[PDB]
Amino acid sequence: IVGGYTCGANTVPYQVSLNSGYHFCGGSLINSQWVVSAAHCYKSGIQVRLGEDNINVVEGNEQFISASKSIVHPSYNSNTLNNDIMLIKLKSAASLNSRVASISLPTSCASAGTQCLISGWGNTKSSGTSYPDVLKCLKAPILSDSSCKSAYPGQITSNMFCAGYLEGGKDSCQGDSGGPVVCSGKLQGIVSWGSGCAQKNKPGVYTKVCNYVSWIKQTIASN
Ligand SMILES: NC(=[NH2+])N1CCCCC1
Ligand SMILES: [Ca+2]
């Protein structure tokens, strides 16, 4: 997250870290046994880390649970990043509390102008590299589809939305991939792609979760 603020320990209780020896992506807990993330975060041997703030220090509220199965969207395209969503089932159910909690799925898509919360442990600089150890947060609005398509001509599908600031300076960044965009208490987005980080006229692009609720619900119900 570039241009954000320190969230505060366990103030984003649905935020997860995906760990393969090191943090490599974010995700969101959507019930006691399932996490949603970006398909471009797919790899084997994932451990899901819940209840994290400082990812390098054991602070006492963590739950570390191995994945038992991962399911990349059937129509994910790695070249265009269309349908950039995956589901991860935990080997055992998480213990839900005030600091580890699920985030609701949307019943309706969010409109442009809605303010959302984006969070992650990704790079905090637009030029250079500095990775924080504690969770960072950013409040950002959903942009109009017209502004989104004008920023990325020929690249924005119906399954994507832009959020952030056309002026630049505030955005998600590398290592935030997979993480949540929460608006009015519902998961509306997944951190997906962009051109660099926090550049003028290049906002972040997010997977539009409301399009996938049916697939999520049916997949969970049979796996
Ligand atoms: N919002 C961005 N600029 N992103 C998404 C996360 C990866 C780097 C590009
Ligand atoms: Ca920790």
177 CB near ligand 1 (under 6 Å): yes
Q: Are residues 171 and 3 in contact, defined by beta-carbon separation less than 8 angstroms?
A: yes
Catalytic residue among 17, 73, 84, 119: 84
Ligand nearest to the CA of 121: 1
8 and 109 inside one domain: yes
Residues 51 and 95 in one domain: yes
Q: Per the structure block, which two tokens stand in for 175?
A: 């290592």
Query: To test the ligand 1 pocket, which listed residue (197, 199, 202, 207) has its Cβ within 8 A of the most ligand atoms?
Result: 197
Q: Give the closest residue to 85 by CA, choosing from 174, 175, 165, 193.
A: 193
User: Does 84 qualify as catalytic in the annotation?
Assistant: yes
Do both 141 and 196 map to the same domain? Answer: yes
Neighbouring CB atoms inside 10 A of 198's CB total 26
Tokens, residue 132 = 């924080």
Q: Are residues 194 and 167 in the same domain?
A: yes
Q: Which of 17, 37, 102, 177 is catalytic?
A: 177
Tokens for 18, please give them. 């995906």
Same domain, 59 and 86: yes
Whether 95 and 128 map to the same domain: the answer is no
Shared-domain flag, residues 8 and 60: no
Q: Is the CB of 194 under 6 A from ligand 1?
A: yes
Q: Is the dihedral of CA 170, 175, 178, 184 positive or negative?
A: negative
- Do 108 and 206 have their domain in common? yes
118 lies in the same domain as 89:
no
For atom 1 of ligand 1, which residue has the closest CA?
Answer: 204
DSSP letters spanning the chain: -BS-EE--TTSSTTEEEEESSSEEEEEEEEETTEEEE-GGG--SS-EEEES-SSTTS--S--EEEEEEEEEE-TT-BTTTTBT--EEEEESS-----SSS---BPPSSPPPTT-EEEEEES----SSS----SS-EEEEEEBPPHHHHHHHSTTT--TTEEEES-TT-S-B--TT-TT-EEEETTEEEEEEEE-SSSSBTTB-EEEEEGGGGHHHHHHHHHT-
Which numbered atom of ligand 1 lies nearest the CA of 205?
A: 1
CATH number for the domain that contains residue 35: 2.40.10.10
Q: Let me know whether 44 and 91 are in one domain.
A: yes
Domain range for 118: 1-12+103-210
Same structural domain for residues 123 and 180? yes
Instruction: Give phi and psi for 206, each to the nearest 5.
Output: -130, 145
Considering the candidates 17, 40, 102, 176, report the single residue annotated as catalytic.
40
- How many domains does the chain divide into? 2
137 and 199 co-located in one domain: yes
Experimental method: neutron
d(CA 26, CA 17): 5
Closest CA to 28 of 38, 19, 20, 42: 38
Q: Residue positions in the annotated binding site for Ca(2+)? A: 52, 54, 57, 62
Sign of the alpha-carbon torsion through 145, 149, 151, 157 = positive
Residue 53 annotated as catalytic: no
Token pair 């020896």 is found at 21
Residue found by looking up tokens 């250079």 in the block: 128
Q: Which of 84, 136, 155, 172 to mutate to test the pocket of ligand 1 (most atoms within 8 A of CB)?
A: 172
